[PDB]
Subunit: 353 residues, 4 copies
């Protein structure tokens, strides 16, 4: 019943300003933090050798896209390796990102691990020495972090243990980040795998987020200095029933309205397995949903922003411009979507839930 | 992790519709649910015998004020006795209230009881046979309910047990209410008693509300079909440090923004020990706070709306008009206050 | 993190002394607390009109059985009505029970109520005015109480909500009882309904008891002054796999060993749908289980002690002795069973 | 509410058998897992330089004492460094320990870290890559692990957060250990720091242990395959009120009976700041307590077993025998104490009576 301030007014202000810059009107996040293992399949999909130089060239391709992306990108999440690489001119990537008006992010979790006694459920590791890592990343240009927890909808999942443990670890991660001036992006991803319908996803999302915020409260987390990266509420990939984008938007916004405190500065949606176009249309619909939304509703896309770019590149230097153009096009589309101004042309119920 | 719908789309619509009507723009709640015992001291202060007829007459006085209060009153909470009394014209009080555009509320808790092993802390009882009682109250004109839990700020309070137990019983009460088409007003009151400061009240308020909403979620409560009746965030009644109304407003709005989901239809503040003017000025400041507020911020006042009317009445039938005039004055003041239009004449620090 | 003693040493001594007397070696509990409605079906099976007189005569029949039951019965649970009835000779039933060396118990819950948003799950009510009732019951002869919570094993049950709510209400009931010198019997019954196997019942039983004791701890319950009335760990009634009494015993004892603190004075098993003989054989096997058991393992039987007696009675006053004889035989059987001396004629796998 | 077995009957049997061997009748644990930064302060008190060889030699001295300690020591906790060191005869320490009938343990936590928003409270880290580490340690001779969480009694502590977080991490640690055939020793230490009295320590200990076992249940921990290492229930080191050993024993056993399920194989008490003699006397009183105790009640002492030996050694290789003799004497004393058969009356050097309490810095 007694307070022992985790943060000073100055620390809070710093975290809040960082959080607001990332999700400023019209801006979203480019998630380019794929590890060697992740980008391996992507490079192979286009027959490109997975070397540090190729990864640098690819990341540089995205990071150095023309100024059209400036008002679209509020933040860029990088993998450890990328945070210390440089563009051809010798400029550290963090400097490139900042010069274009973006905030630099860094992935800090150490992957998922199995939870014994559950049906294939997991939690996420990475707290050991996290404080020291955060202080170092802050000094090296990062202002926000990424940590991914994964839950699955199944016959007996997410279980009480999985929900409780993932919510608790996310709170510890958020607490350590804030102690070091790093805005933590809380990511409790509920996989779309399965044949469950829309209302089941909405139900599970509602229960998971309620546990998440109770945990953040218990750990004295400063919500204004945080962002939320949840799955959109959608039917399972194998669901026989079909839904409109309007219904997906209503279920998503309704779930958030019932669980996310208005103090949370912004919600940056993960696209899961949605196509580039699908992720933009859904985000736009979410923003057009006729319900009050007290937080920014934008994006934090990876493949949903890189798919076409990667394909257009093909690992050939001569395709640089064509590749950057595909990326810029998705950045512009999502910039409009997070404002509810998206249209395929380019620029120009409720109680049942 | 499986859904077993507690409510149908129809039941949700009914509850949401009721909740919205109570807190519609410029409207608040008149809490006239004092029991014979809780009003005894009020009547003796004006040398008036605490009889059923005098209590009926006083309630009639408030309920039958002129149409000027209609746009100010979205709801009126009644005590069991009053729900079954009639005005001089034979009209049941619930009918009187509805005819003036107000929704009828009913107090359903059975008071606080001590929590063993705590330093004078309590929980609230009243769940036994509550479902049957709600079904009957609904048939008799009531559309929402009142249940008060009490928490205190002290050296070791509120304890983990008190917070957890009160949050849980409020969820049980809310669940039963919604099954019967009654909108539950969740009231986790943190008393202003003590010399603690504004920051302490804000901290405790934030912890209590987080616990309350987690409990509501665990019990599958439909938030759009509920209202919240919390204490404003203020320094202790005996706090030596003084604050401005703007500071109280910032502390209050910040606390709510960090704990109350946007889906909650409205917040109807209890006035505690605040004077009539004080309650109106603070509510006005709250609505003028430069932070985004996704829910209606209004009032659910008892003494803060009746103080002057009770004195003006004085137990004399000849002072009917005079007494009602004082009530109307406060209803108007608070109607403007919940819109940030009342004039008596660094948020990172929170 | 500060202590505010819920009980004084004297209050603790009284509760511990009562708890120990009820489960003294060779002693168990006769659960004769059926309500007018819960006994109707049984009186019907023997074509006997459900009247207060027949109910009184039947209870008298059991309570006045000969002295052979004295060393077998440590406690007798009565329904409210019976606590205030008298034998033909004018002796109040509580007095009849005490004169035979038994402690009088009283049912205090007010039945189960549905938990909205769940798949047919429930919680139990009866907390309202419970303190006053316990004080009255204590004054009128009762020293312990009964409160039954019900959980069910199913595809999605018992849910997190049901477990949490039932454990919490059991703790509230326990706290109130102890404040009035009444030993609370904590009864978290998991129904045997379903086709689930033995290991599934054991798993659910372990999770439920773990939740129960955490809640008792949160509510500051004095364990030495309490008893536990759990279901034995058995396969569902519709389970097609067969098990020996030794496996049922090992599963039961293992589950208790993993969740029930040594401080708990005793475990008084409910028999569910088990026959008189089945319940005795299982209790015997439980007491002969090789593992170490730090608490008395006895019985709190209703049907398991009354089945043959009720049938022998058939509502015929002339059958009095024949009926009592059947009850005495089961009392003797279970007294031997709770000592592992009853005979009708790898733990790592758990 | 559905079971998804974390362990097989074979895995359960292996864990249960290990836990029972460690706390077999008359046996206790030698906590010689002090780190370099910790042992340095110890070697400094005897002018001995804190080198790897000196640390190696000191551990060898303890691990190679005569066979009289064999029936006294059921387990020996080592620090990573020591697990890979060898005695002068080339034998790896794990082999030396096992050859004397002891089970080898390994410290796996990575120390405490501050909990933001609390009054100087902490939680403990070390879960990252713990599974792989346990699998490796198991192959290298270890059968049980050590992980220490720390709580403090104060006006506002331990807080709800500290209690819940520490109990949760202990459960994660225990879960990972059991998946790798390692018996986890759950250690929720409540510091003796402060002026609180006996009943306050009992209250706090009861609340903390209840939280610990609820967490272990939530994480599906196999209790028979675990051990508990708690603080004995005692008044704060600065408490004015005095208590007898019988009162300390009653408070300790009562707290345990109200929270520790019978399935727990054994309780290996930490000595806190108690002197060698006090630790033995209290442990003895605990085992003589009239109440029913369904678990082994023994020791897991570090300094409480080494105090006199360290002083007798003085870093002089010529005092080897004299040093080992002091250790053997304390091991025999605690072996009798964990059976309730200890009665001092005799020698007991002045060093065995000196308080070993160190304020939490």
């Amino acid at each position: 019943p007694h307070s022992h301030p985790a943060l000073t007014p100055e620390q809070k202000k710093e975290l809040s300003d960082i959080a607001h810059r990332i999700v400023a009107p019209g801006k979203g996040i480019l998630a380019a933090n794929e590890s060697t293992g992740s980008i391996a399949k992507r490079l192979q999909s286009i027959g490109t050798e997975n070397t540090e130089e190729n990864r640098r060239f690819y990341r540089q391709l995205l990071l150095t896209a023309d100024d059209r992306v400036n008002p679209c990108i509020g933040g860029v999440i990088l993998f450890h390796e990328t945070l210390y690489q440089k563009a051809d001119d010798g400029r550290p990537f963090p400097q490139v990102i900042k010069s274009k008006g973006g905030v630099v992010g860094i992935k800090v979790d150490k992957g998922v691990v199995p939870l014994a006694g559950t049906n294939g459920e997991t939690t996420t590791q990475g707290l050991d020495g996290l404080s020291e890592r955060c202080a170092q990343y802050k000094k090296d240009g990062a202002d926000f972090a990424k940590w991914r927890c994964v839950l699955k909808i199944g016959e007996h999942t997410p279980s009480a243990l999985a929900i409780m443990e993932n919510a608790n670890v996310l709170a510890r991660y958020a607490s350590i980040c804030q102690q070091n001036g790093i805005v933590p992006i809380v990511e409790p991803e509920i996989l779309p795998d399965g044949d469950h319908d829309l209302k089941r996803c909405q139900y599970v999302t509602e229960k998971v987020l309620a546990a998440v915020y109770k945990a953040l409260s218990d750990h004295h987390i400063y919500l204004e200095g945080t962002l939320l990266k949840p799955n959109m509420v959608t039917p399972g990939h194998a669901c026989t029933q079909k839904y409109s984008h309007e219904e997906i938007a209503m279920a998503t916004v309704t779930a958030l309205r019932r669980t996310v405190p208005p103090a949370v500065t912004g919600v940056t949606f993960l696209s899961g397995g949605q196509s580039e176009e699908e992720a933009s249309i859904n985000l736009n619909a979410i923003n057009k949903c006729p319900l009050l939304k007290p937080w920014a509703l934008t994006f934090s896309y990876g493949r949903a922003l890189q798919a076409s770019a990667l394909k257009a590149w093909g690992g050939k230097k001569e395709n640089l411009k064509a590749a950057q153009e595909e990326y810029v096009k998705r950045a512009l589309a999502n910039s409009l979507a997070c404002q509810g101004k998206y249209t395929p042309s380019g620029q120009a119920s409720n109680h049942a839930y």
